[PDB]
mmCIF file of C-alpha atoms in Angstrom:
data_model
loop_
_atom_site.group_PDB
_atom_site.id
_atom_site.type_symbol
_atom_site.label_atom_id
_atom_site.label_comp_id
_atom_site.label_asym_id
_atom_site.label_seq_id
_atom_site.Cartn_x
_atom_site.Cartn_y
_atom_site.Cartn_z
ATOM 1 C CA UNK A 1 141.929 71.688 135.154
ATOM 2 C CA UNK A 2 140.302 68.985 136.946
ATOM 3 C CA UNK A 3 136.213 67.871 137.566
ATOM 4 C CA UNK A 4 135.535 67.456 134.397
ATOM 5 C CA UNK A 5 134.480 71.726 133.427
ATOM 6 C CA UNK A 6 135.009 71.778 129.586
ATOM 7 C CA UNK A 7 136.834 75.028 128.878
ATOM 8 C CA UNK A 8 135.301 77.226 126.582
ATOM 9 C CA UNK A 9 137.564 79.710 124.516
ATOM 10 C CA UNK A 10 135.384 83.079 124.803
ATOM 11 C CA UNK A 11 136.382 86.115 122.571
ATOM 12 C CA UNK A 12 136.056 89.047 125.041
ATOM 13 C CA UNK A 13 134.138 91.576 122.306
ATOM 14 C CA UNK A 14 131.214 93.465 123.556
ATOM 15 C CA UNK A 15 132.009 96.212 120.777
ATOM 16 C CA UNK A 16 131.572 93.691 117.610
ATOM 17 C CA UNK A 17 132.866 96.524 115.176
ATOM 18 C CA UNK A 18 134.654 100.541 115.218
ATOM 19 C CA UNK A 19 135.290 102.228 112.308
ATOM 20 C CA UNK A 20 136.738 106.129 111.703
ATOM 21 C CA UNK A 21 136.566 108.578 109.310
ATOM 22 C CA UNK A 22 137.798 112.007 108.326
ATOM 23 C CA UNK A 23 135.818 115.137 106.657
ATOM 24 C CA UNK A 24 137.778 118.231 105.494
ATOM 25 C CA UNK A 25 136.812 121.146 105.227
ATOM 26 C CA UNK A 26 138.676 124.710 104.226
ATOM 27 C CA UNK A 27 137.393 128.049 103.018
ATOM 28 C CA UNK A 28 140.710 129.766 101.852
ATOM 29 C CA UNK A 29 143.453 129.455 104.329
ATOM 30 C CA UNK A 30 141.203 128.465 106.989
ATOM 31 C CA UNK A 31 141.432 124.553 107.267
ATOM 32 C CA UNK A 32 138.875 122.145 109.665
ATOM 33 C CA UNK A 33 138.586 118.306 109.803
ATOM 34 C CA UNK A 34 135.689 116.604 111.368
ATOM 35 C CA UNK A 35 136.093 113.259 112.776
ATOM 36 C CA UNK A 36 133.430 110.209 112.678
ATOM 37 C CA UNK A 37 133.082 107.049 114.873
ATOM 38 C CA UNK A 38 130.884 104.015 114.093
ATOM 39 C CA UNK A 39 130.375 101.607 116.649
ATOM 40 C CA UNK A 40 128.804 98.682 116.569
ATOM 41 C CA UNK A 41 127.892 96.671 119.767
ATOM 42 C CA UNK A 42 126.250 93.287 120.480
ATOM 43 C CA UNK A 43 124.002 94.442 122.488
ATOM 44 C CA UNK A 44 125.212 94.513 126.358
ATOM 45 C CA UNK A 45 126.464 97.734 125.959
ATOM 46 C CA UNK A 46 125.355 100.676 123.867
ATOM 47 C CA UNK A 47 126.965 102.487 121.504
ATOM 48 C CA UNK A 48 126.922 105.493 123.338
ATOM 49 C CA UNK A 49 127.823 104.054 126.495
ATOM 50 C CA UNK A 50 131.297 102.218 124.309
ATOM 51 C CA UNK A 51 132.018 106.259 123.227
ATOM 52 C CA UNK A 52 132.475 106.523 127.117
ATOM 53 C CA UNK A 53 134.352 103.687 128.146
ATOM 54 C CA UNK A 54 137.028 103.932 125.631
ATOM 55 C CA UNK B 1 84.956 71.070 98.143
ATOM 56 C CA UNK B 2 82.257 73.964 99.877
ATOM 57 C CA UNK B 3 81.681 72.764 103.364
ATOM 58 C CA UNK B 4 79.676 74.866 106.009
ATOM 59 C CA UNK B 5 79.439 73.757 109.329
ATOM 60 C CA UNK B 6 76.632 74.062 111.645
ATOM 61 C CA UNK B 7 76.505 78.662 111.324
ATOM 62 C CA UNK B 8 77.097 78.683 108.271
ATOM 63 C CA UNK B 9 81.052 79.798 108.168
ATOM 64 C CA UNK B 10 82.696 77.930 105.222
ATOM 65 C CA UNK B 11 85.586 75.981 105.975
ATOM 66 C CA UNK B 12 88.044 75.012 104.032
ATOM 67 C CA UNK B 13 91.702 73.777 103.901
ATOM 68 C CA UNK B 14 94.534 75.820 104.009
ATOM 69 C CA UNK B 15 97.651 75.069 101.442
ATOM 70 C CA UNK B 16 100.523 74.926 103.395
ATOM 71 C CA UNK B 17 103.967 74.243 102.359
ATOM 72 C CA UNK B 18 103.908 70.539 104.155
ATOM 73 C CA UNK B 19 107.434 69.667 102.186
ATOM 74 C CA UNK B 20 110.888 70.392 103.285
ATOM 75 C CA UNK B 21 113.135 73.859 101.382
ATOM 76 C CA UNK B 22 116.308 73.718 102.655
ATOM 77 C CA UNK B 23 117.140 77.572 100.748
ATOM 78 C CA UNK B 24 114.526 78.436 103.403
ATOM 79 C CA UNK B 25 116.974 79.106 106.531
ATOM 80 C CA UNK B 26 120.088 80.179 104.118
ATOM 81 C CA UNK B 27 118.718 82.986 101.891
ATOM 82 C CA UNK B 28 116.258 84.681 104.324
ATOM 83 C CA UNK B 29 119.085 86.279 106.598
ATOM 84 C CA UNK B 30 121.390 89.490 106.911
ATOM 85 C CA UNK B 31 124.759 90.707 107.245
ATOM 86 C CA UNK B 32 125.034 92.939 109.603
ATOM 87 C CA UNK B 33 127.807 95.710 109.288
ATOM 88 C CA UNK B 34 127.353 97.286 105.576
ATOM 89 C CA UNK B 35 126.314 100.551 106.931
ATOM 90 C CA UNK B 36 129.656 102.717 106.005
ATOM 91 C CA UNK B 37 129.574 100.780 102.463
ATOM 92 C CA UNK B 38 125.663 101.584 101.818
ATOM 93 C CA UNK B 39 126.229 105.191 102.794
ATOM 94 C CA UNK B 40 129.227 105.550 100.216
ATOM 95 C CA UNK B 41 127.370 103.456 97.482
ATOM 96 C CA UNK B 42 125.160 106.590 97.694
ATOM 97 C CA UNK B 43 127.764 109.003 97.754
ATOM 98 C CA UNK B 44 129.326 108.296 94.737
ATOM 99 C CA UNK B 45 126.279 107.834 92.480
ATOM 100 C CA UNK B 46 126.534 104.009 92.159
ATOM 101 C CA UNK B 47 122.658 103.805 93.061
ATOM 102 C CA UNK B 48 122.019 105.408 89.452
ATOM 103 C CA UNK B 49 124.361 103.114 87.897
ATOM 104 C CA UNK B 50 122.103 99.917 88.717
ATOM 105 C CA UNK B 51 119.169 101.798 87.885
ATOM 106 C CA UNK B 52 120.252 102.655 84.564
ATOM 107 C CA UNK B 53 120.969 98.934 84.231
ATOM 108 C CA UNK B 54 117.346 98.520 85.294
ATOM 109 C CA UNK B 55 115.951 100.723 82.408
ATOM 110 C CA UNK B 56 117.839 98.908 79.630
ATOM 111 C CA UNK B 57 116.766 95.421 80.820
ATOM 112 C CA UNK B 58 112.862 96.511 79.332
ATOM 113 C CA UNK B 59 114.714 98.189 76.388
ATOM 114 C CA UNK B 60 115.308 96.700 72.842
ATOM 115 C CA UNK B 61 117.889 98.664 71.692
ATOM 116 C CA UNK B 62 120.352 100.642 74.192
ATOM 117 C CA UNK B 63 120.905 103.787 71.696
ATOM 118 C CA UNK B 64 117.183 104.617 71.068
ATOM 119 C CA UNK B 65 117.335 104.787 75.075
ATOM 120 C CA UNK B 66 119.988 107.006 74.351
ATOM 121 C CA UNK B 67 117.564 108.597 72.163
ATOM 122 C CA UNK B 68 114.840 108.786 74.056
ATOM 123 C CA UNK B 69 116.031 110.101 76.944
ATOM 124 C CA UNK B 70 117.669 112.829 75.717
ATOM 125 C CA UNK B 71 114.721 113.694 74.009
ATOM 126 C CA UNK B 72 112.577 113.795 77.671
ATOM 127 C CA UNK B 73 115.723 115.978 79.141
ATOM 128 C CA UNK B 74 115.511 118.532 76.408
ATOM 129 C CA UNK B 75 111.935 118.636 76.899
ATOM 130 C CA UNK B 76 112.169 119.861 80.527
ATOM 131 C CA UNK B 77 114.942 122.588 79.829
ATOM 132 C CA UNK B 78 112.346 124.176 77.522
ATOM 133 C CA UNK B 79 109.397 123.952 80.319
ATOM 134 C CA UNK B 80 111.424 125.261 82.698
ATOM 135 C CA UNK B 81 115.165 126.710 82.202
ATOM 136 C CA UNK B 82 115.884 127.748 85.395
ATOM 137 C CA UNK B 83 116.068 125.034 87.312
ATOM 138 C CA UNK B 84 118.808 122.486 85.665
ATOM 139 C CA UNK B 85 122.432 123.212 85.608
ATOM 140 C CA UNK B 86 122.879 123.384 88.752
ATOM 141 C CA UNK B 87 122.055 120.772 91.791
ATOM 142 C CA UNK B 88 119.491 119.791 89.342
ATOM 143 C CA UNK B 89 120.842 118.078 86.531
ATOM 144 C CA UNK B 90 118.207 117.618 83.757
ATOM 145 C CA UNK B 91 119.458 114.069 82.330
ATOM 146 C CA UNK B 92 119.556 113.119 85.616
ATOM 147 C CA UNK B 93 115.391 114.146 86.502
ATOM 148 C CA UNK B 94 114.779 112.292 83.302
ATOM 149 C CA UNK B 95 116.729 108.562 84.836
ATOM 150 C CA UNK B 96 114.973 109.373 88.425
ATOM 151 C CA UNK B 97 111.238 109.699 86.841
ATOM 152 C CA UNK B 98 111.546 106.769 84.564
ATOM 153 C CA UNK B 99 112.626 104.740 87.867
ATOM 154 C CA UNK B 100 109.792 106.255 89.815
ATOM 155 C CA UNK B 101 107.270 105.304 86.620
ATOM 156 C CA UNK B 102 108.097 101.923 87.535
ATOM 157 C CA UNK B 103 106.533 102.506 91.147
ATOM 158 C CA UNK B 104 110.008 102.458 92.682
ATOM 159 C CA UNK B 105 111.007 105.310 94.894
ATOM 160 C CA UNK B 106 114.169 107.682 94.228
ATOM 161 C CA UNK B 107 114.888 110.927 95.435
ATOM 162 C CA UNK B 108 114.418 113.622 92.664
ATOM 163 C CA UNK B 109 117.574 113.745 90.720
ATOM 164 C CA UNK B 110 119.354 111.701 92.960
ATOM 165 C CA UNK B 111 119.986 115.214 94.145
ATOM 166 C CA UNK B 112 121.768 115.046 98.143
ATOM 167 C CA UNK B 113 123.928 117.130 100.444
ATOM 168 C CA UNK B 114 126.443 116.891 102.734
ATOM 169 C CA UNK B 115 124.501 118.183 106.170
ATOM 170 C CA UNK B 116 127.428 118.455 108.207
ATOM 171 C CA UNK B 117 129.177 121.766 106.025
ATOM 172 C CA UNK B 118 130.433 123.879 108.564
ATOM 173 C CA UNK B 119 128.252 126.783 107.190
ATOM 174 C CA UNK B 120 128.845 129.208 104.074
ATOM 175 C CA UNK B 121 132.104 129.524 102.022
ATOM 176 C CA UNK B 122 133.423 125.831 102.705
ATOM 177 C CA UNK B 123 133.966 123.326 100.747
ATOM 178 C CA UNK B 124 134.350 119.799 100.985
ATOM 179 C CA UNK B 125 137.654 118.802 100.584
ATOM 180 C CA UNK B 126 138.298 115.447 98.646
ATOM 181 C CA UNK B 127 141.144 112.914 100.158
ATOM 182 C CA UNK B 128 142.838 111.261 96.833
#
């Protein structure tokens, strides 16, 4: 903190937005969920690429 | 007013909007993350629930729409049986053709499926 640089509070968030969701499924005993991610980025990343990193 | 200038090409003056609307920059933007709500609107029929609010905004009297359409829906059971009861509800072709007689565009008996069934025999399973 000196020189006169003006700090600037940045919010480290290239993935603006991630939801999940669950689907079930059965036929009889036989029980199987499926699982869905949304991702929403701001651009300097994609959405498929965020999948990866995480 | 008609002015033609030298090869023949009439000019004239454009209207232009040469004043100041503030509710221009406010109102023409977008949110952004409504994607999981849209998809659910159309999952549990509310799409057909502001389209039926549509209808009875040109209609006098709500129970002669009653009426009416009832009348249509046992119209098409008669011209062909076979093809309502099922994913094809007849009351509901009726609401989607009166929508699409207004040149708007609906899907035919706001008829859809899940595309990601694991094949035959299962069945959705709803979380309460």
């Amino acid at each position: 903190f000196e020189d006169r640089s003006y700090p600037i509070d940045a919010v480290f968030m290239p993935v603006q937005n991630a939801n999940h969701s669950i689907h079930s499924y059965g036929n009889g005993n036989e029980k199987q969920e499926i699982l869905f991610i949304e991702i929403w980025t701001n651009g300097s990343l994609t959405p498929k690429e965020a999948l990866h990193e995480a | 007013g008609i002015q033609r200038d030298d090869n023949g090409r009439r000019i004239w003056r454009r209207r232009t909007l040469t004043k100041k609307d503030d509710m221009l920059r406010y109102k023409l933007q977008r949110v952004p993350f409504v994607e999981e709500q849209v998809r659910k609107i159309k999952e549990v029929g509310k799409v057909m629930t502001m389209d039926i609010e549509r209808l009875l905004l040109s209609e006098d009297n709500r129970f002669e729409f009653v009426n009416s359409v009832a009348a249509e829906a046992t119209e098409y059971v008669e011209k062909n049986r076979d093809e309502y009861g099922g994913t094809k509800k007849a009351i509901f072709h009726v609401l989607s053709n009166r929508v699409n007689d207004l040149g708007f565009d609906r899907p035919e008996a706001y008829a859809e499926s899940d595309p990601y069934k694991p094949g035959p025999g299962y069945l959705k399973e709803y979380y309460t």
